[PDB]
Amino acid sequence: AVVSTDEYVARTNIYYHAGTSRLLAVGHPYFPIKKPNNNKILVPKVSGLQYRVFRIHLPDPNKFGFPDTSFYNPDTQRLVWACVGVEVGRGQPLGVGISGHPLLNKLDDTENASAYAANAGVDNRECISMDYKQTQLCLIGCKPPIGEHWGKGSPCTNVAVNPGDCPPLELINTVIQDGDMVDTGFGAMDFTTLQANKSEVPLDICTSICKYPDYIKMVSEPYGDSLFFYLRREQMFVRHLFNRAGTVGENVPDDLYIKGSGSTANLASSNYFPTPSGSMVTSDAQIFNKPYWLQRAQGHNNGICWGNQLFVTVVDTTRSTNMSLCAAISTSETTYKNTNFKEYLRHGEEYDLQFIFQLCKITLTADVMTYIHSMNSTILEDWNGGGSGAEDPLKKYTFWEVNLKEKFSADLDQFPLGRKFLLQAGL
Amino acid sequence: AVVSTDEYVARTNIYYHAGTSRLLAVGHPYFPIKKPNNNKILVPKVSGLQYRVFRIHLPDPNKFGFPDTSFYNPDTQRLVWACVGVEVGRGQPLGVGISGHPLLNKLDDTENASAYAANAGVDNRECISMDYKQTQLCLIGCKPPIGEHWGKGSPCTNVAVNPGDCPPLELINTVIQDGDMVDTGFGAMDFTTLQANKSEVPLDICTSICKYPDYIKMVSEPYGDSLFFYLRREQMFVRHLFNRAGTVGENVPDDLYIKGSGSTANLASSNYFPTPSGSMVTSDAQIFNKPYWLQRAQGHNNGICWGNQLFVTVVDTTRSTNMSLCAAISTSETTYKNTNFKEYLRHGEEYDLQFIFQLCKITLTADVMTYIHSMNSTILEDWNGGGSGAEDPLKKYTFWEVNLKEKFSADLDQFPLGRKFLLQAGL
Amino acid sequence: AVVSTDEYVARTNIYYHAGTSRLLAVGHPYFPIKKNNNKILVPKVSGLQYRVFRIHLPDPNKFGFPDTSFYNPDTQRLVWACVGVEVGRGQPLGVGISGHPLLNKLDDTENASAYAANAGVDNRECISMDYKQTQLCLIGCKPPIGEHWGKGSPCTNVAVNPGDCPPLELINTVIQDGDMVDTGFGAMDFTTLQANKSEVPLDICTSICKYPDYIKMVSEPYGDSLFFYLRREQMFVRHLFNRAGTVGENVPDDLYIKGSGSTANLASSNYFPTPSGSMVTSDAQIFNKPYWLQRAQGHNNGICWGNQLFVTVVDTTRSTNMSLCAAISTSETTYKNTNFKEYLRHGEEYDLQFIFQLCKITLTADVMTYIHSMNSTILEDWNGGGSGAEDPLKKYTFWEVNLKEKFSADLDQFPLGRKFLLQAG
Amino acid sequence: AVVSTDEYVARTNIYYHAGTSRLLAVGHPYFPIKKPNNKILVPKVSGLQYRVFRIHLPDPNKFGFPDTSFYNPDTQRLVWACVGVEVGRGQPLGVGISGHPLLNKLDDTENASAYAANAGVDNRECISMDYKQTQLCLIGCKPPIGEHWGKGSPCTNVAVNPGDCPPLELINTVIQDGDMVDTGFGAMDFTTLQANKSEVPLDICTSICKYPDYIKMVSEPYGDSLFFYLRREQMFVRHLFNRAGTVGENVPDDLYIKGSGSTANLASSNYFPTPSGSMVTSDAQIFNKPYWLQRAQGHNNGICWGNQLFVTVVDTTRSTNMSLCAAISTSETTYKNTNFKEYLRHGEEYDLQFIFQLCKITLTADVMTYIHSMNSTILEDWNGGGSGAEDPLKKYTFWEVNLKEKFSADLDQFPLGRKFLLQAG
Incomplete structure (x- = not known):
């Protein structure tokens, strides 16, 4: 049976504040820019519509150098940080970006038609853009966030699939990686x-x-x-x-249906698809630049950062404004020419992550050592024993790596989240 | 006289949790795909505009295997499950699908017209799609849900019905079955x-x-x-x-009206019909992924699950995203050809039902036995008597069948709805 | 180690009211009208501008109180603290509009029935738009700090071919009165x-x-x-x-998969959206309401160091531009476009009101050391009468507001003063 | 110094209810109908107009109370104080619509697929718009004061050339009955x-x-x-x-960078938007609700000096115009545009209800001095009487409302009365 961490994680009175300086990401909103016969990414894809999966690295509280160590017994117990406050600071002006395709598969406008559409030739694709569905979300835990999407299921060595057969669906679970895309209005597939x-x-x-x-x-x-x-x-x-x-x-x-005749003899595509729009973006509906007090979790792990890790997952499309920048190829002619100016697109994203951590102690009794072990073997192995420190067990996945080892401060007084925390401790 | 179940159904202290794993439905939004010649459904019609009617089968508490049985007398009394909590889980991202017809009966756009529209010739039907009226509903009881709609009434054997005469209307009551369609903006008919x-x-x-x-x-x-x-x-x-x-x-x-002349000599069709639109869909307005606590019902049945059955009906159009997927007939030519790609439409629906159940006991007194007998003769007969198979009284109607006989747990702790419920019992 | 002003600054019981009369700006919404010259004849006045107010306070040390027994002019010093603010706004609610006769708009890509033509020479269009909506008020004793994307410096490597994409850099700046808010095209x-x-x-x-x-x-x-x-x-x-x-x-x-015929040459996938600050509304108003600055989130709890005060404002909920035109001739009873000269003007109306609380600082060692590190000019401006008190922000331009002769102790007689009392018994 | 009326105006325990029967106003929405004999045949009545009601009260010193012992006619005088108002509104909610057959609108600049042609002679269009939505109520004992932009006086230097932009001035004015509210184009x-x-x-x-x-x-x-x-x-x-x-x-x-060919000539960048007051809704109604005037932000706490009262209302939420059309013949059978004359009419329905509280002033030496400074028509009009009471606001026109005959002590018997009794207890 699983038990609340409240049962075997003792709460001390020590609180540390930790914060990233100010994270900045700049790039092309649609695709990475690279050299043609190079593979190296010269400019990255940075878009309002990506996940930001932050892998937070906390200083080992057991290796840490506290001013005073009489509050616990290093021989019988160990130490883990508990997350108690999170502030996801967001930077740019609020706004909506926009995404399209030069050759979107768009036949006709079926919202309203005055007469039966023509007939599909070869390539009726249009250049179309849309403002994606609006999404804000913040996921915090000490393990990476897991996602779902529809993908191509394995087939049946049965009725042989013929070219063009509708491929089978399967719900695929996956780790959400930094830079992965949110559903934007066409579902998760x-x-x-x-x-x-x-x-x-x-x-x-x-x-x-x-x-x-x-x-x-x-x-x-x-x-x-x-x-x-x-x-x-x-x-x-x-x-x-x-x-x-x-x-x-x-x-x-x-x-x-009743068979038609003449122009209506031939059925038009009834494979309809809609154009999403996530509507107005608004200050009052903002989820960020507010503090979240992780005091009582709905799960059995109450904000404990096992393995001195923390995961913060963020999607924010309320600041997805892209900027077009163009440079002139010649600053001479006093007449506008489209061929004189090269047009580009750029997007910047601006985060600032802040935290309050509560220090915690765990007496390593037989029962607890069993439970911790069953729960995650690596916890015990990385503590006192930890001659190793075990290489990255998620090296195959990629996250925005945030190092907070040198950013813990006991003076909560001196940081904006810190003041807020103490003020809310007026209780 | 009918009385509240609180009068003759005794509450015990025992609470069990139960839950469908993760229910999943994939198919075509508009119609089932079958293999011409035959008629067997190859791909089923799965749509956000369908009723989902879950017939939840519970284990018979009199046949169930409790660790302790000293809480009741199996001679004088019987056991029934009561439903105390429900969480309807929903899975895909929020979103809005789209329905239409390649030959929808739409003469002119009447919303704004600059000259008198032409003349209806033969077949003026258009390829028109719409986004349906948004609906979220959840129905819970121990009997199937009952619907209403308009159908063709019976005529009264007098004046003959000339061909094309207007059919007579009758409000018809019906059992709502799994896979039935919801009103979408053209009313229930x-x-x-x-x-x-x-x-x-x-x-x-x-x-x-x-x-x-x-x-x-x-x-x-x-x-x-x-x-x-x-x-x-x-x-x-x-x-x-x-x-x-x-x-x-x-x-x-x-x-x-005053008779026209020339173009206006002939009245344009004044058989108006509008195009429905269920507007924006939003997190804040979600009915689902929230627990409902069924402590105090408006009716005389306070969540008693007679028959050890439980009915849960749901409509959720706030996830009606259809996804187009298309397969290349050839993987060769580097020129797009519409003839090279077969287009399809699929929809996916994800559910996860979770319940809290209270154990109850009924002393089979003379009066209780008369009362329960009048209410529903089958209740006593399926108790002690049991007697042979006890045939399904609803074999005509089709429901998404759900079996919870093995999913009961007395450790509410170990489940999210269970945690919420124990926490809610912090009163 | 920084500390609350509550620590070293003592609150007196004396409160003053101060207000501007009615501040008024009129000009042209889009650009300054000038002369051969550079003389600005009519200023650019827009609802899309920051207003940054540099409020000047009477030196409470030089100030002349009826009673001077409440403090010791040898051990301590005086500072104004700001305890209430009302940013009065004056015109009707409404939304102005902005455009360019030669905006870089190729085609409409929201919806399209045929593949667009081909970009010729100059495809620009006369397009206007209603800008994103912003209300903000910022108050501090230092001027506000803004961010925007600018052209960064290039690293002495790959030579820059003309027309290469310029390097971005996030740039911090002092928001000056007259600077423009982000309008729907980001801050750049x-x-x-x-x-x-x-x-x-x-x-x-x-x-x-x-x-x-x-x-x-x-x-x-x-x-x-x-x-x-x-x-x-x-x-x-x-x-x-x-x-x-x-x-x-x-x-x-x-x-993508290559096209042909009309789809053989890609169309521009350099999309940009048009913004809309939607509806404006009284219920959503930020202004014409008192703000009580009792508990600040920062360590400076509303103390007006240097006897200054910065009130920064953006209000696009009153951005109505009004076209006034003039007949060149008054004879003809038949309309001719050539007969009327068409103009644009914009009006902005402000009225700033404040409640200030008198404060005192005993000049101990620790306090003078602390305040020195914080801002040495504070100690220099006091008793010594910091000679040649030259404006350290002469580079920057704000709306200069002189309330040195507008302080009144009778809070009774002013709307904000009346409000302050009621909200305090 | 000014003081609150609570100081020198004492409250009695006597209340009167008073109400207009049912005020009605029927006219043409856009302009008054006259015979080309400026005797107005039909007046201009629109939902976009200010309603300024001058409410006349019985002089409580002349008034006949059953019991006069509550005050001393030798040392004190009487005033009504306004404590409760219901502005009843009568028509159904709806929105009107205004336009001009020859509106100066050149092109649609929200979206253009190619450069617009050229302004020849008169490109004016027949264009209508639904105005900005406005609800307001103003209560005071002096008439309300408005601001609008007018043509300022020129500076006696450079001669105004024909078609030079006129100078602006923000002009203050008494808001009169029949005046227009801003509708989207600002107040000018x-x-x-x-x-x-x-x-x-x-x-x-x-x-x-x-x-x-x-x-x-x-x-x-x-x-x-x-x-x-x-x-x-x-x-x-x-x-x-x-x-x-x-x-x-x-x-x-x-x-900008100069264009050529079609973009050689700059399209008019003199932009203007079309306003839209949006949906009107019950939930957002300001009227048919009672207002209890107990604590005024001002020093006049609802005292109706001069036995006068001003109630200003704008309500664009019932602006529905009705077209009514009449036939020239009556025989025929076949629609002819020329056979039916089309008109426009607008109807407004009001109902003003009031709770008034009797008050007493004791004329000590201080109070007379104060009231004399404030407005001594008050004192002259009290015991004086023979004053030849001529209207000091004759220039201005208001909806004159006579309540002198409408005061009743039986609050019970009126809707605003029961409402009042329930809330005070």
């Missing part, structure tokens, strides 16, 4: 492996996986390590109602 | 039998019945079995304003 | 990041759009720059457009 | 600032749109003009247009 077209959705997702947080799974999780706090805000409406060109994969059953 | 046309409304309700709950009737119901708890949230507005082609069934009385 | 220097001169409307087209650096200002150890703020900003995408120009960064061909 | 004098006669719709295009000068009214020392208000105003931008006419002030060429 693997567009590379599910859309050979390469044109159903805009550039910034058309060969990416859009992932949704598996909140249901992460909360069912027995120990509740992957998330012991979250906020989520998401809104979307249908802005346009369009058609897809291409050939009919599955035909419309004739018991659903 | 039988479009098969009321619209010979087959083109008045989009394919997914085109040959279906749209059913709305008969809240009035169910709450009027004397013992209060079919629903002891509900939540409803429906919204809709007029996106477009259209005309219907077809011939005038009932002419416009000429005392309402 | 368009002058140096957009050689074009035609990516955004005339009024920010050769300007810096700055956004307050809240995170830096709050982080500031003493917290002098702002000890109170309110912000309200909202925006959505009204239109979805395309940029003419030539491609600076080609679309990677792994992201 | 469209007659003296727009010689076009075509920038704004008919109903305001030769009128003044005034906005209440709240700031001035509250800053007023005695606070008579308004001792209570509710305002509620909202607006978004529905369309984005140009003005044709000629360039009064050229676009500085440091703001």
Whole structure:
């Protein structure tokens, strides 16, 4: 049986504040810019519509050099940080960016038509943009955030799949990595492996996986390590109602309509797809630059940062404004020419993460050592024994790495989150 | 006289948790895919605009295997489960799908017209899609939910019905079955039998019945079995304003208007129909992933699960994202050709049902046995007697069948709904 | 180790009221009207500008109280603390509009039925737009600090071919009175990041759009720059457009399948959106309400060091621009466009009210040491009468507000003073 | 110094209710109908007009009370104090619509697919708009004061050249009955600032749109003009247009790169938006609700000096115009545009209800001195009487409301009375 950390994690009176300086990410909103016959990423993809998965590294409280160590017994117990406050500081002006495709698979406008559309030729693709669905969310836990998306399921060595057969679906669970994309209004699916077209959705997702947080799974999780706090805000409406060109994969059953004649003899594509719009962005609906007090978790892990790790997952589309910058190729002619100016797109993102940690002690009794062991073997192995320190057990995944080892301060007094914490301790 | 179950159903201290793993439904948004010649469903019709009616089977507490049984007398009394808490879990990202028809009956745009529209010739139908009225509802009782809709009434064997005469209307009550369609903005009616046309409304309700709950009737119901708890949230507005082609069934009385001339000599179709729109969808307005505590019901059945059954009906259109996936017929030519790609449409729905159940006991007194007998003869017969198979009284109706016989746990601790419930019992 | 002003600053019981009469700015919404010359004949006055007010206070040391027994002019010194503020706003609510006769808009990409033509020479359009909505008020004893993206420096490596994409750098700046708010195109220097001169409307087209650096200002150890703020900003995408120009960064061909015929040459996927600050409303107003600065989040709890005070404001909820035109001739009874000269003007109306609380600082060692490290000029300006008291911010321009002769002890007689009493018994 | 009326005005325990029966106003929405005999045949009545009611009270010293022992006629005098108001509104909620057959709108600048043609002679369009939504109520014992932008006096230097921009002045004015509220184009004098006669719709295009000068009214020392208000105003931008006419002030060429061919000539960047007051709604109603005037922000706490009372109302939430049309013949059978004359009419319905509290002033030497300084028409009009009481506000026109015959002590028997009794107990 699993038990609340309140049971075997004793709470001390020591509080430390920790904060990143000011994180800045700048890039192209749709794709990485690289050299053509190089692989090196010259400019990264940085977009309002990516996950920011922050892997926070905390100083080992057992190796740490406290002014006074009489508050615990180093022979019988060990120390772990407990997260108690989080402030996700956000930087830029509020705003909405925008994403498109030069050759979006858009046949006609089905919202309203005055007469029956023409006939699909070869390549009816249009240059279309859309303002994606609005999403704010913050996931905190001591394990990486897990996501869900639809991808191509393994087939049945059965009825042989023929070229063009609708591929099978499967809900795939995955670790959400820094730089992965939020669902933007076309659900969470693997567009590379599910859309050979390469044109159903805009550039910034058309060969990416859009992932949704598996909140249901992460909360069912027995120990509740992957998330012991979250906020989520998401809104979307249908802005346009369009058609897809291409050939009919599955035909419309004739018991659903009366055969037409003349122009209506040939059924138009009924493979409709909508254009998302996440609406207005607003100060009052802001989830960030507010402190969250992680005092009572819904899970059995009450903000304990096992392995001196912390994970902070953030998606913010309320500051997704892209800026166009263009440089002139010649500052001579006093006449505008489109060929004189090279046009570019850039996006900046600005974070500042702040924390309050409560120091905690764990008497290493037989029962507890068993439980900790069952729960995660590595905890005991990394403490006193820890001759190793065990290499990164998630090296295959990538996160924005935040080092906080040299940023713990006992003077909460002197930081904005710190003051707030103490003020809220007026109780 | 009918009395509250609180009078004759005794509450014990025992509480169990139970939960469907993770229920998952994938299919076509608009119609089932079957293998022509045959009729067997190859791909089922799965849509956000469907009712989900879950028939929850509980273990018989009299047949169940408790560690301690000294809490009741199995001679004088029997056991029943009571439903005390429910969490409907929902999974995909929030979003809005889209439905339509390749030959939807839409004459002119009547919302704004600069000259008198042309003349209805033969077949003026258009490829038109809409975004349906947003609905979230949750119904819980121990009997199936009951719907209402308009269908073709019976005529009264007098005046013959000329062909094309207007069919008579009758409000028809019905059991709401799993996979039934919700009202979508064209009201709750039988479009098969009321619209010979087959083109008045989009394919997914085109040959279906749209059913709305008969809240009035169910709450009027004397013992209060079919629903002891509900939540409803429906919204809709007029996106477009259209005309219907077809011939005038009932002419416009000429005392309402002054005869035209030339172009206006002939009355344009005044058979107006609007285009529904369920607006923006948003986190804040979610009915789901929140626990409902069924402590005090409005009816005389306070969450007693007679028959060891439990009915949970849900509509959730706030996740009606359909996803297009398309497969290349060839992987060769580096020129897009619409003939090279077969387009399809799929939809995915994710559920996860969680319950808290209180154990109860009924002393089989003379009066209790008379009362329960009148209420529902089957209750006593399925107790002690048991007697053979006890056939399904609802074999006609189809429900998403859910089995919770092995999912009961007395450790509420180990589950999220259980944790919430113990915490809620901090009163 | 920084400490609350509560520690070393003693609150007296004396309160004063001070207010501007009614501040008024009138000008042209988009650009300054001038003469051969550089003489500004009519200023650029926009609801899309920061107003940054430099409020000057009477030296409480030099000030002349009826009673001077409440303190010892040998051991201690006097400072004004700000305890209440009302930023009065004057015109009707409404929304102005901005555009450019030659905006860089290629085509409408929100929806399209045929593949667009081909970019010729100059495809620019006369396009206007209603800007994102902003209300903010910032109060501190130091001027506000803003951020914007500018052209960074390039590293002495890869030579810069003309037309290369300029390097971005986040730049901190002092928000000056007359600076422009972000309008829906982010906070950036368009002058140096957009050689074009035609990516955004005339009024920010050769300007810096700055956004307050809240995170830096709050982080500031003493917290002098702002000890109170309110912000309200909202925006959505009204239109979805395309940029003419030539491609600076080609679309990677792994992201699409080549077209043909009309789709053989990619269209511009340099999309930009049009903003809309939506509806304006009384209920959402930030101004014409008192703000009581009793408990500051910073260590400076509203103390007005140097007898100064900065009130920074943006209010786009009154940005109505009004066209007044004049007949060249009054004879003809038939309308001729040539007969009327068309203009634009904008009016801004302010009325700033304050309640100040008298404060005293005993000049101990520890305190003089602390205050010295904090801002040496504070000790220098006191008793010694810091000679040649030269403005350390002469580089910057603010709206200079002189309340040295506007202090009244009768809070009874003013609206804010009346409010302050009631909210205090 | 000014003091609150609570000091020298004493409260009795006597209350009277008073009400207008049902006030009705029917007219043409955009302009008054006369015979070309300026005797107005039908007046201009619109939801976009100020309603300024001058409420006349019975002199409580002349008034016949059943019991006079509550005060001493030798040493003291009587005034009514306003304690409760219901502004009842009668029509259904709805929105009107205004326009101009020849509105100066050149192109649609919200979105253009190619460069607009050229301004020839008269490109004016037939255009209507739904105005900004406004609810306000102003109560004081002096008439309300408004601000608007007018044509300022010129500076006696450079001769005004034909078509030179007129100078602006913010002008203060008594808001009269029938005046216009701002509707989206700000508060200005469209007659003296727009010689076009075509920038704004008919109903305001030769009128003044005034906005209440709240700031001035509250800053007023005695606070008579308004001792209570509710305002509620909202607006978004529905369309984005140009003005044709000629360039009064050229676009500085440091703001753009010269075009050619079609973009050789700059399109008018004299932008103006179309306003839209949005949906009107029950929930957001200011009227048919009672207002209890107990503690006024001002020093006049609802005392109705001079036995007068002013109630100002704007309500654009019932602006529905009704077109009513009549046939010339009556025989025929077949619709002919020429057979039916089309008109427009607007109806406004009001009902003013009031709770008044009797008060007493004791005329000590201090109080007479104070009241004499404040407004000694008060004193002259008391025991004096023969004053030849001529109206000091004859120039201004208001909706005259006579309540002298409408005072009843039986609060029980009126809706505002029961409402009042329930709340005080």
